[PDB]
Amino acid sequence: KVYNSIFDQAYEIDPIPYFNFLRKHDPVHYEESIDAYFVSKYKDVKYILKNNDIFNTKTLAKRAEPVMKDRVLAQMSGQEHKSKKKAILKGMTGKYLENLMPILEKRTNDIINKHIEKKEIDIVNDFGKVFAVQSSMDLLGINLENYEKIREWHNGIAKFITSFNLNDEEIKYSLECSDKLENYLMPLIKDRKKSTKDDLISILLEYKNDENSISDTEILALSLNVLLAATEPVDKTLAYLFYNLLKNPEQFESVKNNPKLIKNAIIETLRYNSPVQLIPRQVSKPFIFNNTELQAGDTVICMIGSANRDPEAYSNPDEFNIHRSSDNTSHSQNLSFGTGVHTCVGASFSLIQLEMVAILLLKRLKNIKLKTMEITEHGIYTRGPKSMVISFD
Ligand code: HEM
Ligand SMILES: CC(C)C[C@@H]1NC(=O)[C@H](CC(C)C)NC1=O
Secondary structure (H helix, E strand, C coil): CCCCCCCCHHHHHCCHHHHHHHHHHCCEEEECCCCEEEECCHHHHHHHHHCCCCEECCCHHHHCHHHHCCCCHHHCCHHHHHHHHHHHHHCCCHHHHHHHHHHHHHHHHHHHHHHHHHCEEEHHHHHHHHHHHHHHHHHHCCCHHHHHHHHHHHHHHHHHHCCCCCCHHHHHHHHHHHHHHHHHHHHHHHHHHHCCCCCHHHHHHHCCCCCCCCCHHHHHHHHHHHHHHHHHHHHHHHHHHHHHHHHCHHHHHHHHHCHHHHHHHHHHHHHHCCCECEEEEEECCCEEECCEEECCCCEEEEEHHHHHCCCCCCCCCCCCCCCCCCCCCCCCCCCCCCCHHHCCCCHHHHHHHHHHHHHHHHHHCCCCEECCCCCCEECCCECEECCCEEECC
16 A cells, blocks of 8 residues: 555645655555556656657647647657657747847846836746746747737646646636637638748748648647747746745855856756656556566656656755756756657757846846745646745845
8 A cells, every 4th residue: 555645735735755755665656546657766767758669658649639739749759750840949049049039038128127116026927927928929920919818728728738637627628728729829820821920830831741731730739839838837947046046145146246157057946946847658568667567558757856856866956056067976967858859849948048037137126135935836747836026126
């Protein structure tokens, strides 16, 4: 019999003691309520994600396609996945990136300008959630006139993708959000293909595979994939970043005096408070980790936050330290963007965007002081603070 469950109320309040227990005592941990095994150690998570043929992404057909309306990038393999991944990357690199970043600076400063006279701002609810959705629409090429509705519908499909055992009414609402996004974006996709622009939607329409153009619902699904993937982690990471810096004033000062450290601080925040906590895969054939036997068709769920705090991978893993280095002590590449075939295509863009935002907040909000002295965190699949208020001059 087992008594420590991922679904204990205590886990969502504070999962760190669970991480420590599971890595030591139950590294491949079965949860009967969802018929899945949770994998907590860095070595095992990395092995699973590096081995796309043994641990495939068929789980996503279930957790995602109902709201994405067609296949997502992570469900693809082979030359199709490689090529469409490259097509998505094009939209956040090269000239597309050079054009997008001044726009994201504008989004950042407009939000700051709304709150600068108030002398406080909620990094979660005033800045992060607004900026995150606007940035994703700017990347895709969706004009912001309806961004508030977009955010509402996004939250509904994200809830579907990040939840376990939702009830029938919650499912209904998430599917209605999906339908509304489809009803809004399909007319825009049609207009885009008869008048191409310089945005990701246009790239996807211009995509050609053996002289074949993919269906408009396939475009919609990759567009929803980008909207969800780019929006959800951003408010969480921005909030955790300023919280951890304000909780470690010495490191916050080092960052002020040396802005080159902001990139390392973002990476450490992603390791320490991983905003995407879980990555599921399906087992393709009998397999064993430690002495836990897995069968073809079983589901394994990689615990990214647990892996990123594995003492086998990091010295003093449960301390926030922006000065960690492989040149120093033990240090590894964190798994916050995944690894292997499906490594986040937006990882580099994310680091550039978050550094821009953090620079502008530090430049314009003078003498930042923490007001939310103790965060409350929510979510076990994606995870972040409910609120993270700072004050400034
Ligand atoms: C801090 C920000 C972000 C984090 C922490 C994050 C996290 C992740 C993780 C953990 C995965 C792996 C999922 C898996 O293996 O099943 C992933 C994949 C992906 N992410 Fe991100 N993500 C971020 C931002 C973005 C952005 C800005 C985009 C913009 C398009 C994006 C698009 C994608 C896509 C398309 C995939 C699927 C990649 C593939 O299948 O090859 N993500 N992300
Ligand atoms: C969105 C998923 C259907 C596929 C894949 N999964 C991920 O974990 C990331 C982040 C989201 C969980 C926000 N994005 C991805 O594309």
